[PDB]
Design a binder for these strands. Structure first.
Ligand SMILES: [Mn+2]
Length: 641
DNA sequence: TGAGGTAGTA
DNA sequence: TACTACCTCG
């Protein structure tokens, strides 16, 4: 779009596969008794993990880079309450082609096991899975921090080893929960180990043999505190230092594992166009809409609820709002609620009266509330159709970031459009889908930006579902609501929509929706947005920019949407064009620009495009509060930000 | 409950 | 997927 440059990925190309590696051994597996269908492939992979050596499951059999004579061919296996007796028959070598991706899967699996097994025999670094911690730079009062990197090893379509490296840290408590609590450290909110039925506490403990060595002390000397944020030292690295350590560790592991000499891979990068944020006029951040004016503001009524027991609006909030609305060319009406939650139903009555007099949202001035009470209050207001923005009461006028963000949140919750984009984009309706609020079940939800400008953010009623997969009919129904909204604002159907999915798109999840869209004459683009596994991106030379489009393979690409040096090293998004005919650069363009639409964050843009961020917040808040409160809440109002 | 990210933990 | 810590304010 702008300049096409160059980058490094945190992957490294090592030696190609020697002739022992291109033609892996084929092992036919025999179990006794023959398994059960749902439980076969995992059991088979378990067999591969039991024969030792570098072997993986190859379809209905096993593939091995290790000679069959240095594997435990015949063995016994326990699986969730069933004893299997396995035996492996070597059936020669089967040649695999890296160009064939289906077999490249197998080769890459073998590579991963290679990395694992070889990392096992490294003295004397700390090895957990494909991670390795090979130094210490931080200690503590009974806890130390190790420093290394998380790795991966796979094969390319060329047929050579590629090695992904990313600097990491490990938190290690070095004292038993007995000894640790004896040094003078507070109670850990979690603790990994190393009567109502006869056998007493001490008896059942010691007789279980769980007292052979350690002190007395559930127990105390029989567990270990898994320290987290509990017991500072920034574990975030500036991109430069991280890039360096990535190099160093790459070379080290390549050398100390007989994998060769690493060459940092270079990908072609493209600098994307600068988004045109707009309030009443051009802005650089949504917070500037409070001085410049709102993209679209009508006659609005906002109410105040003080729980700290005090007076009216603190003059700076009043004046800020007056500046914002005077600039937006709209009349403002501020109310004060003379009511309190301790009134019982009279409080809900107060809320009902407020709603009936046109109040669109309420600002809650209050000392730090507990999760319980905050939730109850939120939902209670919500049941009268009033979104609420909480602002903590120890609030001085100089804390401008906090209260300008609270104000922005308020305005966003009252149904105002605070910012918009001014450009040319392939889609004029962009909708994001996510599932969350998890537990025994999840909520599948959608949020949308309607119009080319994105000058309209809405949410749809989420739907309870068994897992992460959203039902096809639920997908099409939510999308239908987004469409219907678009037609309510534009008087027509959208020329083209952009479907964004948080995470990988399960098979045929969007089948129904895409068919419907196709019938109505609506062009679409389905894009899967994965927040991780995109690895890292570094400038081959020069400064690290913000707005990077890195087309990798076909239909997939990386996208660096946000970067600020002080926060650490940016993690690019991995995006897959799952369905559609729009060019990748155009989609990257639109998504990157959609990243700036989020109005509730006034001084920092989110990493995800606004509809996905909104969808995330939405399913979280719905899963947290409950869906039962949302019946009388307007969809133009972002109650969940 | 100010918001964002990058870091950590399950 | 959640949660907490620290940094800073496009
Ligand atoms: Mn908020």
């Amino acid at each position: 779009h702008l300049g096409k440059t160059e980058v490094f990925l945190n992957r490294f190309a090592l030696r190609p596969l020697n002739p022992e590696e291109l033609r892996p051994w084929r092992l036919e597996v025999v179990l006794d008794p023959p398994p059960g269908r749902e439980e076969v492939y995992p059991l088979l992979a378990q067999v591969a993990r039991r024969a030792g050596g570098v072997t993986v499951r190859m379809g209905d059999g096993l593939a091995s880079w290790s000679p069959p004579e240095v594997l435990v061919l015949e063995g016994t296996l326990a699986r969730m309450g069933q004893t299997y007796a396995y035996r492996l028959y070597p059936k020669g070598r089967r040649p695999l082609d890296p160009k064939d991706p289906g077999e490249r899967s197998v080769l890459s699996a073998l590579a991963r096991r290679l990395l694992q097994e070889r990392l096992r025999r490294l003295e004397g670094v700390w090895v957990e899975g494909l991670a390795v911690y090979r130094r210490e730079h931080a200690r503590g009062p009974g806890w130390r921090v190790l420093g290394g990197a998380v790795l991966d090893l796979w094969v390319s379509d060329s047929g050579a080893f590629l090695l992904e490296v990313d600097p990491a840290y490990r938190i290690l408590c070095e004292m038993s929960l007995e000894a640790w609590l004896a040094q003078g450290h507070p109670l850990p909110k979690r603790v990994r180990n190393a009567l109502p039925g006869g056998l007493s506490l001490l008896d059942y403990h010691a007789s279980k043999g769980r007292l052979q060595g350690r002190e007395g002390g559930h127990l105390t000397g029989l567990l270990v505190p898994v320290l987290t944020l509990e017991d500072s030292l920034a574990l975030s690295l500036p991109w430069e230092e991280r890039r360096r350590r990535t190099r160093e560790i790459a070379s080290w592991i390549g050398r100390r594992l007989g994998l060769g000499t690493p060459e940092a891979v270079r990908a072609q990068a493209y600098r994307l166009s600068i988004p045109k944020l707009m309030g009443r006029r051009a802005v650089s951040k949504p917070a500037d809409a409070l001085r410049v004016g709102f993209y679209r503001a009508q006659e609005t009524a906002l109410a105040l609820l003080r729980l700290d027991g005090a007076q009216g609006w603190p003059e700076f909030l009043r004046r800020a709002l007056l500046r914002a609305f005077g600039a937006s060319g709209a009349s403002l009406r501020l109310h004060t609620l003379h009511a309190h939650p301790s009134q019982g139903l009279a409080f809900r009555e107060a809320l009902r009266k407020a709603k009936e007099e046109g109040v669109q949202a309420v600002l809650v001035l209050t000392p730090p509330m507990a999760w319980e009470d905050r939730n109850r209050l939120k939902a209670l207001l919500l049941r009268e159709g009033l979104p609420s923005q909480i602002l903590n009461v120890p609030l001085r006028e100089e804390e401008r970031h906090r209260w300008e963000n609270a104000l922005l949140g308020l305005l966003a919750k009252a149904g105002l459009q605070v910012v918009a984009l001014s450009g040319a984009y392939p889609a004029e309706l962009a909708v994001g889908f996510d599932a969350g609020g998890r537990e025994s079940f999840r909520f599948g939800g959608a949020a949308c930006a309607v119009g080319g400008d994105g000058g309209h953010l809405l949410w749809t009623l989420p739907e309870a579902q068994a897992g992460e997969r959203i039902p096809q009919e639920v997908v099409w129904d939510l999308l239908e609501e987004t469409l219907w909204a678009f037609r309510r604002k534009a008087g027509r159907l959208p020329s083209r929509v952009l479907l964004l999915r948080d995470g990988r798109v399960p098979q045929d999840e969007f089948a129904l929706a895409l068919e419907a869209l196709a019938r109505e004459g609506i062009a679409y683009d389905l894009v899967s947005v994965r927040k991780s596994g995109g690895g890292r991106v570094y400038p081959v030379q020069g400064r690290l920019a913000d707005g990077l489009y890195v087309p990798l393979e076909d239909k997939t690409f990386l996208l660096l949407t946000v970067h600020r040096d002080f926060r650490g090293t940016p993690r690019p998004l991995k995006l897959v064009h799952e369905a559609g005919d729009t060019p990748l650069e155009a989609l990257a363009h639109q998504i990157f620009h959609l990243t700036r639409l989020y109005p509730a964050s006034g001084f920092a843009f989110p990493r995800l495009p606004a509809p996905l961020h909104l969808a995330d917040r939405l399913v979280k808040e719905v899963g947290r509060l409950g869906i039962r409160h949302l019946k009388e809440v307007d969809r133009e109002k972002l109650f969940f930000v």
